[PDB]
């Protein structure tokens, strides 16, 4: 640790710009894995409807598909409103 710590204090004295660069790039690489909010990014991206939601032909046995958009069944965004 001393050799690296002595190396850190040296580059701070000589190349503070490059110290900040590597520190900043490091947080970019690391924090997304440690963040608890990263999962919502995919969920929000997935919940944006660029396409028409083509309905399914009611064959008489898809109980988890809503008949009407205001019916209980189907994905909900209550999680998104509280975000």
């Amino acid at each position: 640790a001393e050799r690296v710590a002595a190396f850190l204090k040296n580059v701070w004295a000589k190349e503070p710009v490059l110290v900040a660069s590597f520190a900043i790039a490091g947080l970019a690489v690391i924090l997304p894995t440690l963040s608890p909010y990263t999962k919502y990014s995919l969920m929000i991206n997935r919940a944006t409807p660029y396409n028409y939601p083509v309905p399914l032909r009611d064959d008489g046995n898809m109980p988890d598909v809503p008949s009407h958009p205001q019916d209980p069944q189907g994905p909900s965004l209550e999680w998104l409103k509280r975000l």
Binding site: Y52, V54, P55, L56, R57, H68, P69, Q70
Partner: protein, 114 residues
């Protein structure tokens, strides 16, 4: 290779919903709730058939339900609705976020009268 079969101009005749996009956008959220059944039947038809000529009758019922939907607004909430879509119409982007007060007045009107 064969002639294309086109419907006659007198099979394409339906009464048109002649209102502007700002009017459609203001009513869109209630329109989607009220006219879901004919609307989702037309779209299932279009995607299944892949032919506009095979869905004309379904498309005509979309028009009728839309006119009936707007007649209901006309009879009951005409003035709260006009204020609302006039506010939406001012915005260059027709933004919902700029008209929440006029939207609130319209929403409570249709919630009470309908």
């Amino acid at each position: 290779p064969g002639i294309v079969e086109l419907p006659s101009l007198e099979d394409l005749k339906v009464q048109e919903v002649k209102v502007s996009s700002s009017v459609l956008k203001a009513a869109a959220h209630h329109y989607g709730a009220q006219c879901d059944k004919p609307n989702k039947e037309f779209m299932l038809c279009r995607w299944e058939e892949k032919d506009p000529r095979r869905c004309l009758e379904e498309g005509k019922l979309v028009n009728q339900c839309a006119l009936e939907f707007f007649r209901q607004i006309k009879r009951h909430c005409a003035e709260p609705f006009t204020e609302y879509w006039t506010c939406i119409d001012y915005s260059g982007l027709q933004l919902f976020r700029r008209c929440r007060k006029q939207q609130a007045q319209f929403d409570e009107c249709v919630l009470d009268k309908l």
